[PDB]
Design a binder for this molecule. Structure first.
Ligand code: RET
Ligand code: RET
Ligand code: RET
Ligand code: R16
Ligand code: R16
Ligand code: R16
Ligand code: R16
Ligand code: R16
Ligand code: R16
Ligand code: R16
Ligand code: R16
Ligand code: R16
Ligand code: C14
Ligand code: C14
Ligand code: C14
Ligand code: D12
Ligand code: D12
Ligand code: D12
Ligand code: D12
Ligand code: D12
Ligand code: D12
Ligand code: D10
Ligand code: D10
Ligand code: D10
Ligand code: D10
Ligand code: OCT
Ligand code: OCT
Ligand code: OCT
Ligand code: OCT
Ligand code: OCT
Ligand code: OCT
Ligand code: OCT
Ligand code: OCT
Ligand code: OCT
Ligand code: OCT
Ligand code: OCT
Ligand code: OCT
Ligand code: OCT
Ligand code: OCT
Ligand code: OCT
Ligand code: OCT
Ligand code: OCT
Ligand code: OCT
Ligand code: OCT
Ligand code: HEX
Ligand code: HEX
Ligand code: HEX
Ligand code: HEX
Ligand code: HEX
Ligand code: HEX
Ligand code: HEX
Ligand code: HEX
Ligand code: HEX
Ligand code: HEX
Ligand code: HEX
Ligand code: HEX
Ligand code: HEX
Ligand code: HEX
Ligand code: HEX
Ligand code: HEX
Ligand code: HEX
Ligand code: HEX
Ligand code: HEX
Ligand code: HEX
Ligand code: MG
Ligand code: MG
Ligand code: MG
Lengths: 226, 226, 226
């Protein structure tokens, strides 16, 4: 029931995650019995879950015609975006309870975005604004407590945190902008194009992010983990 | 599909949680880099989640005609009641493995209560009794191992624990009593009145509890958090 | 909607879990002030959750006629199989981050198995293969990382781990074999017989496992817990 372009977009996301899974799985094998192996392993789980959920959408299991609702992508994001933040929190050396609070905010952001996607205007816009409020709090925490914590660590660990922090922030800001421009609000981006855009940003946000992270020198990953 | 009285009750709950969010949000900001900030932060998250779920019920998103089933309140409780017990566990100095067991019992209590609410008599009463059994186990834990652990701490931390322990017990006992008197069992309390009562108890159990906790002297919260 | 044999199988599983919960619950209460009490408590929670889900299937709550899908057993397994792996990880002395990774693989195994159960052939077989891939990763970790960590512990703790590791592995391999032979796939085993078989293996994998673990000498459980 979806457009041909939407199906192409789902295939792009799926193949991207599968390639990521091979890359990070191999890196994790290469890092067995080494400090810092948690980083390729987390990257591997992120792309494995995203890849599985892309497959459920290809198969029509987590999409629903009402326009097609691609609700599987929220099942993906509600699991993978916390693990991405966990990555930065470990790099930053952030206290576990603070990491937990940001993960709670993130899950709230994704679930209110799901409600926004399922609703009709203008109620959908209310939930979009609520979810953006949670996003802004997450961005503020990244730019403040994460950054202050990372600045107390070794220079190379701090440098890697800042690179990934900035990469994550730029990519994540793309999502609510695409949402607002797409069929859920202003209807500027056609539904099929929207699926393709999300797949490209997903690949950047998960495979690109993991490539930057896991390509750091092994000594840096070792000291970052402890 | 709900009565006007029920809608009034949902708005009371919603506005109460929003006011609580302002209070605990300001307290969390004020304790930004102080030991004990975890307490206003958890209180903020509790009323944020409860307020969002009250909003989903106002909007008819988590309410289903089957006779109006307010199943959104279980999505609220299954998340917020564990965090309330975590609060008491940190104050008591309780070992995390013991906190985990009581949280598991609490999630079991809420989920069996959801099955009781969705079921028809007499099967609904079976699940009510099972959920009550989990509740009695939680109460016994609060009165025994939580209380013995708190009694090892200094006088002011122990006194704060006991105040919040007693407050929590009295308010939580109200819930299964309202449930038994309302539409799901004896049908003594009309559905609309039941919604109003839950909103008032919810405000007391989340905002009132958080106010007692977050108004303690900051040095006590700092000591309790260690 | 379900056969008489299938209902008999559900009652066998339910009664087995109730028996386990009495045994492990009383053992947990008897160990209330001792090191190692986490083992009977986790065993109690495992059979409590499984028994409750068996009850939901007896009552038709987590069973849907499609020709009958027993989807409640996935709600059971997604919670209990992680706790069983946690048991082995505590006995082995495994690093918590490693336990978290195998638990993630296990949840993925159970959820992809649920998708396989809900799907139609040949798509169901794709998810079965994916789930088997996760299962193989779990078995590999049990036979490598868990085993290496246990061998660095006291001979009595290590001997207990190996006995439970071998017991668990043999029993868990039975599940995907039954699945492929049964009603969710190739229909060699009648549906009613398949329910009875799952009840028997479930009792062995939860009550039998818990009996072996909690019957160890209390000093062995004590040093394993630390
Ligand atoms: C791997 C997937 C990633 C990094 C997805 C990130 C998604 C977001 C940051 C979503 C943001 C949203 C809002 C801030 C408002 C409501 C709409 C959303 C869910 C797209
Ligand atoms: C903020 C919300 C709170 C503190 C809610 C607490 C709810 C309960 C203690 C519910 C208890 C129930 C039983 C013990 C039996 C079954 C019915 C319930 C779920 C109302
Ligand atoms: C107490 C319940 C237990 C120990 C259940 C264990 C279940 C499994 C190991 C399931 C395995 C499966 C596969 C590996 C492939 C797909 C079918 C499953 C879910 C039966
Ligand atoms: C309807 C079938 C459409 C098939 C579309 C093929 C996708 C083309 C591959 C693009 C994968 C990008 C991988 C990026 C790796 C970093
Ligand atoms: C370094 C260890 C970090 C551990 C992070 C714990 C995750 C906390 C997430 C719990 C939040 C539950 C949100 C439920 C829906 C709002
Ligand atoms: C058929 C429409 C094609 C749509 C092209 C979408 C490109 C969107 C890119 C947005 C951000 C790119 C992140 C890449 C960073 C390396
Ligand atoms: C001091 C921090 C304590 C944190 C304990 C978190 C325990 C998490 C609860 C585990 C129980 C899961 C049961 C799920 C049943 C659906
Ligand atoms: C071990 C748990 C004790 C639970 C206390 C039982 C309270 C009585 C509830 C019985 C349900 C009666 C349904 C009312 C029929 C209108
Ligand atoms: C010691 C810390 C954990 C204490 C909580 C134990 C969990 C007890 C749950 C019991 C549920 C029984 C329901 C059946 C009653 C008829
Ligand atoms: C040291 C104990 C002080 C805290 C005591 C709190 C008592 C809570 C009063 C709540 C009033 C609700 C009454 C409902 C009775 C059915
Ligand atoms: C512990 C529960 C306290 C609840 C107090 C509520 C008092 C008002 C309830 C009156 C309901 C009677 C409605 C009359 C119309 C049928
Ligand atoms: C003693 C160590 C306990 C470790 C428990 C951590 C559990 C983390 C589970 C990771 C969640 C992955 C879920 C994927 C699908 C929702
Ligand atoms: C889709 C699942 C991906 C599986 C991970 C692939 C890992 C490849 C291992 C490569 C090891 C090479 C050693 C030199
Ligand atoms: C649609 C009916 C809603 C009326 C309730 C509004 C109450 C007045 C607003 C109070 C503002 C709350 C400040 C935190
Ligand atoms: C109505 C179904 C008959 C009841 C049979 C009872 C099942 C016995 C379970 C065995 C428990 C095993 C504990 C080791
Ligand atoms: C800042 C944006 C808040 C959400 C407003 C959405 C308005 C969409 C207009 C749709 C016209 C087709
Ligand atoms: C028709 C309005 C009914 C008003 C109900 C008042 C509820 C007070 C509950 C107090 C419980 C602590
Ligand atoms: C409309 C209802 C407003 C309730 C706001 C509650 C703030 C104080 C809570 C005290 C709990 C006893
Ligand atoms: C521990 C709970 C007691 C068990 C009650 C089982 C009730 C079975 C009812 C079957 C009727 C369809
Ligand atoms: C122990 C951590 C390894 C988890 C690996 C999961 C493997 C999933 C395989 C998917 C089937 C192709
Ligand atoms: C690497 C994944 C291994 C999967 C094992 C295959 C299970 C049997 C497939 C038969 C399905 C019809
Ligand atoms: C929280 C403030 C409530 C203001 C009510 C707005 C009414 C809009 C409904 C059309
Ligand atoms: C009222 C709930 C059941 C109470 C059992 C525990 C009482 C022990 C008091 C120390
Ligand atoms: C941390 C103890 C393990 C409990 C696993 C529960 C998994 C629920 C998945 C839905
Ligand atoms: C009527 C079902 C009886 C099933 C027999 C259970 C015992 C078999 C253990 C191998
Ligand atoms: C770290 C995994 C988070 C999963 C959150 C799921 C909430 C629906
Ligand atoms: C029906 C919900 C109206 C809320 C306004 C939405 C835009 C802020
Ligand atoms: C974590 C803060 C969430 C704020 C949501 C409301 C913003 C309008
Ligand atoms: C985009 C959120 C603004 C937060 C900035 C915090 C101060 C660097
Ligand atoms: C059509 C190919 C898409 C490649 C995505 C690249 C992500 C940075
Ligand atoms: C439409 C009913 C609104 C009720 C407002 C309640 C005041 C807190
Ligand atoms: C229709 C407005 C009635 C609101 C009642 C307010 C009770 C707090
Ligand atoms: C500083 C402690 C933050 C704890 C917040 C967790 C809320 C679930
Ligand atoms: C800081 C005020 C938060 C407002 C609560 C919003 C409830 C969804
Ligand atoms: C800010 C909350 C708006 C709620 C609108 C309710 C419309 C039925
Ligand atoms: C009658 C609708 C039941 C929906 C409840 C689902 C809550 C997880
Ligand atoms: C610690 C709060 C999260 C509990 C959520 C459980 C939902 C089944
Ligand atoms: C002590 C941790 C127990 C958690 C198990 C929860 C299963 C219902
Ligand atoms: C069909 C289930 C009936 C159980 C009723 C038990 C009430 C105590
Ligand atoms: C489309 C029929 C299969 C349904 C599978 C649902 C998986 C979430
Ligand atoms: C259209 C889905 C086909 C899945 C292939 C089955 C692999 C055994
Ligand atoms: C993959 C099967 C290995 C089983 C070996 C365990 C010894 C009983
Ligand atoms: C190699 C020893 C494994 C024996 C366990 C089998 C239990 C059915
Ligand atoms: C080593 C066990 C893998 C599961 C394959 C199931 C056999 C049909
Ligand atoms: C792993 C990609 C499979 C593609 C099938 C056409
Ligand atoms: C491995 C995925 C193949 C599915 C084809 C739709
Ligand atoms: C459109 C139905 C999707 C529900 C997502 C949980
Ligand atoms: C059912 C999910 C509701 C989340 C709103 C915070
Ligand atoms: C769970 C939220 C559903 C909203 C449908 C409009
Ligand atoms: C904090 C509210 C954000 C709204 C911007 C769209
Ligand atoms: C709108 C909420 C923003 C919070 C910033 C700390
Ligand atoms: C089909 C769109 C391809 C865009 C390349 C980044
Ligand atoms: C979602 C079903 C939960 C059952 C609790 C016993
Ligand atoms: C858990 C679902 C219960 C529904 C019974 C009508
Ligand atoms: C209309 C009910 C109001 C209740 C406030 C105590
Ligand atoms: C009607 C407001 C209720 C406040 C909680 C005591
Ligand atoms: C019930 C609210 C109490 C507030 C104490 C500061
Ligand atoms: C007919 C009842 C059989 C029970 C087997 C344990
Ligand atoms: C280090 C692996 C943890 C995986 C988190 C989902
Ligand atoms: C792991 C793929 C399916 C997850 C949603 C049930
Ligand atoms: C299932 C095969 C496991 C391999 C053991 C190293
Ligand atoms: C390896 C487990 C031995 C079997 C115990 C009955
Ligand atoms: C793998 C079993 C196939 C059965 C064909 C009837
Ligand atoms: C009824 C059979 C019990 C199986 C115990 C291993
Ligand atoms: Mg929409
Ligand atoms: Mg009901
Ligand atoms: Mg099937």
């Amino acid at each position: 029931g979806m457009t041909q372009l939407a199906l192409i977009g789902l295939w792009i996301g799926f193949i991207g995650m599968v390639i990521g899974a091979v890359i990070f799985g191999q890196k994790a094998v290469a890092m067995r019995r080494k400090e810092g192996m948690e980083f390729p392993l987390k990257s591997f789980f992120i792309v494995l879950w995203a890849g599985a959920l892309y497959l459920t959408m290809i198969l029509g299991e987590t999409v629903t015609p009402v326009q097609t609702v691609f609700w599987g992508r929220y099942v993906d994001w509600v699991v993978t975006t916390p693990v991405l933040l966990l990555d930065l929190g470990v790099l930053a050396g952030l206290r576990p309870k603070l990491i937990a609070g940001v993960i709670a905010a993130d899950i709230f952001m994704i679930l209110t975005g799901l409600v926004a996607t399922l609703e009709a205007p203008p109620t959908s816009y209310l939930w979009y604004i609520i979810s953006c409020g949670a996003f802004i709090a997450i961005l503020a925490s990244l730019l403040t407590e994460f950054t202050a914590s990372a600045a107390r660590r070794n220079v190379r660990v701090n440098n890697l945190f800042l690179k990934l922090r900035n990469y994550l922030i730029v990519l994540w800001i793309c999502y609510p902008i695409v949402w607002l421009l797409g069929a859920e609000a202003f209807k500027i981006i056609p539904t099929g194009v929207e699926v393709v855009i999300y797949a490209i940003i997903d690949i950047a946000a998960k495979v690109g992010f993991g490539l930057i992270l896991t390509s750091a020198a092994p000594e840096i990953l070792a000291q970052a983990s402890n």
